[PDB]
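Objective 1b of the project was to move from sequence-level analysis to a structural picture of ligand recognition. The entry below was assembled by the postdoctoral researcher (A.K.) and checked by the PI before modelling. It contains the amino acid sequence of the target and the SMILES of the bound compound, magnesium ion.
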Amino acid sequence: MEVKDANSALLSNYEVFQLLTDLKEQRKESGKNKHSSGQQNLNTITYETLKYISKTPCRHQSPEIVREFLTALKSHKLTKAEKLQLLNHRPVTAVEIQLMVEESEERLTEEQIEALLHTVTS
Amino acid sequence: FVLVEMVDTVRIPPWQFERKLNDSIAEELNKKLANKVVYNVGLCICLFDITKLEDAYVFPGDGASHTKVHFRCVVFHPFLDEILIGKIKGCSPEGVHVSLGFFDDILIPPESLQQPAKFDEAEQVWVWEYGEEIRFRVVDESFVDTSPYTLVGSISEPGLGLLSWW
Amino acid sequence: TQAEIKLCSLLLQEHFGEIVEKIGVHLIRTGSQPLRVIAHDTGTSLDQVKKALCVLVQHNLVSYQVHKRGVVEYEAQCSRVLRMLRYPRYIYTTKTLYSDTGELIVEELLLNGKLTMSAVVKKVADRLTETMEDGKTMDYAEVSNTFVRLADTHFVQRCPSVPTTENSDPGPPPPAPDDGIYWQANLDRFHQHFRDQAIVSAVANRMDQTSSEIVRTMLRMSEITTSSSAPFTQPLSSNEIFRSLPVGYNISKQVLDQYLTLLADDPLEINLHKALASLATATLESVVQERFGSRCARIFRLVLQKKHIEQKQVEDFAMIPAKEAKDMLYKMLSENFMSLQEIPKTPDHAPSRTFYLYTVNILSAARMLLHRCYKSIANLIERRQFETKENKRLLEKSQITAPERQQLETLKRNVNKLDASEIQVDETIFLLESYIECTMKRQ
Amino acid sequence: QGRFRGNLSGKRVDFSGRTVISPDPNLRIDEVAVPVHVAKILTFPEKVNKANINFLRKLVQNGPEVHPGANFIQQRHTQMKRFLKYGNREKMAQELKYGDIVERHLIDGDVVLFNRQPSLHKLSIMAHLARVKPHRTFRFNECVCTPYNADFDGDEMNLHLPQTEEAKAEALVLMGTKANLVTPRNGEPLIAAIQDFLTGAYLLTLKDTFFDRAKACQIIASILVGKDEKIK
Amino acid sequence: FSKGEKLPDVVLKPPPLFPDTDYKPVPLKTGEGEEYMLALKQELRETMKRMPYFIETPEERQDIERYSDWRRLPREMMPRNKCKKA
Amino acid sequence: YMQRRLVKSLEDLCSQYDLTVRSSTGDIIQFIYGGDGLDPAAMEGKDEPLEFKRVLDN
Amino acid sequence: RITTPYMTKYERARVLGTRALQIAMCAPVMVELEGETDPLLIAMKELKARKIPIIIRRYLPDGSYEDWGVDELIIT
Amino acid sequence: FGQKDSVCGVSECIIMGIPMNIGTGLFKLLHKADRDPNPPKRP
RNA sequence: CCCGAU
DNA sequence: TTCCGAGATCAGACGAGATCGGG
DNA sequence: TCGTCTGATCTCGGAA
Ligand SMILES: [Mg+2]
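Corresponding predicted holo structure:
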């Protein structure tokens, strides 16, 4: 079970949520009671996991938005981790970007931060 | 969340030879790597894809089929730069306990850094006043086997301001 | 000599790093080995091996030479790596024999390995001026005066001409005007000079104060005309002895001449062969005095008197009882000091023989104690390796409760008790290693 | 006697028996007659696989006293073999599910393998199908006795019983008597008629003999038992 | 049976011991230099760094270190005060 | 004994799949087994696989 | 493509070796069998009908290999 | 000598209890079930 | 170790 | 004269089917 | 029980 590659993160919350939504509804098609005497830990993690991602209103979140938001993000010069925070955190208001958002120091400018609110709202 | 490329030798018992391998390996690998934190890696969840499945041997003993499987699985591992949103499923006087919603109740924040009205005085007082946000700060996992927990976190709360709720 | 290699793993770990130790210590373990073969056997990438050998050739620990294959086989000299242990002692005798300026000269020459004159005088013009008064700037001309003053007494010798082989690259070794020529320190001259302090302390603490000074002035005027491979010093006349006396003395020529024929005729015997041979046995005798009391040390000196006359006289010649004596023999046997029964000539019989006689062999008891002293400093450093990583939380707090500070002053009492004790066993190495080098032909 | 030459190579072996041999020409060359008492002891773990479920249910009601029966059941998960003598066999019969092991008796159609103990060539171990007969001697066809170099003057020869299903096919295909009819020194056949059969068939094919339809249909109809009873 | 009791001893105590921290006064001079150069040999250019830490770190981000009078006069004298060999 | 010495040297040879006969350590003893790569067991009399007079009349 | 296209007696033994042990662990049977309860007798019915889900991995001794389906071989 | 022997032949695979590679253990067997190296998902 | 079987 | 190397002449090794049966 | 191979000292012989 050796892990060859420790990391490779671009899985935005929507991606993982979407995979889980297809998986949950697909596992039940073949849901088995033979494997109950064996394994059931998988069911619990997927089930509860869906809810936490669901907290973020990825309900109504779309696949195209990932590229659409990304196209705006590349201009801002924020790092890949920062953008994932920006999509996953989905800052509802300016204060989270204004204060909660990472790398606030220097790059804030009170210019693109205001523009980001228009982009994040989109 | 982060993808983790992993390699496992997955043994399909011979009464599953009707089903397709890439599905019937995936049913095994979910039973192998769910709700299990891998040391220095993170909390595995489920199977993303099987990126490369190589040829099904059958060994001189078992009669089963052992396919070495390259795959990618999504895991839970905060990147030391994430402002998460959880819920307080517990309050200890040394520090609060936050839990991500039905994810893992194993994130234990130490509390020393918020505004100078900080104590938990055993009557379940959250914070002496002026969903809950969290900053995951360090990676900390302890390998359990020792003789003949395990992803705990330390979680901060700086001067965010928290405009909506205090 | 595995405990020797235990130290070279420890000495490079504390000074430079870990991979420069690893590639270093492997080269001590497998010898004349090429660049690609070292990177394949230690499991190290080739970019880091080129850097690690670059630091190792700078501090003159790994020497390179090609013979037949057209491929350079690096080779590390083992006994040079342990001379890093003596490094602060090499600083100190340049403070007793030269000023603070020249003491800093051998320091940055020992630190940065290979140095040109154009650099090392430029560096001490920074360090000595920053500790002196601003506006009262130390003038560098006095440094160039004391720089050659070290070299006329031959304390600093130059590097052998570089091979300049194609595999070797000139640009990487220098760290970034004039080129100049490089040198290391002549630490071999120190091993004369450390021996000069050794014999003058051997006479003064045995014979008399005035006996030792004429040994010093004999040896101070025999420095360049000998080498370390000299079996004894160059022969002198007594008339230049009266010329070379210091101005503190006032002794008449004829009274010191009586002391000159007194000092020439001793059990000690300037015979440099007999000098290190007599000083090594006192180092042996100070170890049994350290370990087995004065009673076992009394029979330890008895076997240095008679070569093979034992166990029919040792119960008589020391008058100690047969029970108490024979446990001292077998403890001197089991710890390899008493050497063995090399006289039994009856054939293949432990019970019936011509009676086994004990006999000390001075070199087998020497090479063991040197191997023991190599083992000793392994247990010194590893303790100071042990107590360091825990207490790092409170070193930066000064940069604090009452048991927190009390752990620090019990640490700093410990480390300073360890580090001082690395040097006190170090003087036993050189006192015995110079005896080892004095009985080794063809090297 | 040491561990190399006698405990690592030549090690003692379970599921293995040894009797005196006696002839039986009425078997095919590929079959050994195994006594009942031995065949009730030497057991083959036959796992339950949707085709021997009714067959193993039928034989586990017999238990370890009637010969087509069993004497051990492992459950599907390393439960200790359940010595099928004390309990209710029919309650163990009905509760028998897929996957679990039944140690049924040495039945006919099983693959045992002989050995005559001074093994001098490849042919001294040969596999044989096993038919449970009524005696305590190992009875084989006498054509296969010159590979064993075995006369019936009180000679004994061992019978191992391979346990796994992979070692059952390696006996049948590689070491079967129908495969090793031919010695690997020359290429000559070693399994062929010995003694009476040769002097029987010489006296029959001799030029002088003449049979009427009385004796002719009597000698011929001797060859109609045991895979031969269904031919015109 | 005379020794069949336990491990001989946890430790064997030698009635005579080490003398002291021998040569007490003067190794204050060498002893500080033991710790002085070790403060400077570790903080030198002639050392190596754990670039295996940086290949271990997939968390690289901005704002962290992981991301980020000699008073003298000219002269020239080259002496051969030293050996002319090798 | 002579059976024992013989088989304790000769046991770890097998004709590999490219018709070569190698030792356990990979070293080649024979390039084809016995020149023709033929079973002595299946071999017909006269060390020939056919004995063509018998097959043609058959 | 270079080894013998005849199924050797050591390959027929192990293919019948493991297809017997597979079918004795409730494998899916490929021959719509007719009452054979010995798993080994099912496997020879699998071989003669040439329906065995097994590919022989033939190792040339240098380390290279060459696959061969049991459908794609000449049994005796 | 520091003799690293591999475990081959038959006088060691019988001692160690490995299936020997001489004869039936020369080759190895695969299974012919439904499989393919599939496409992944877009991330 | 004896004996005996083959 | 020297002698360095080599053919000659003892001494020590560690081997010598397989199984089965009983006192 | 020799039977074997090994490897260890002596000695008459040629080269420098
Ligand atoms: Mg007989």
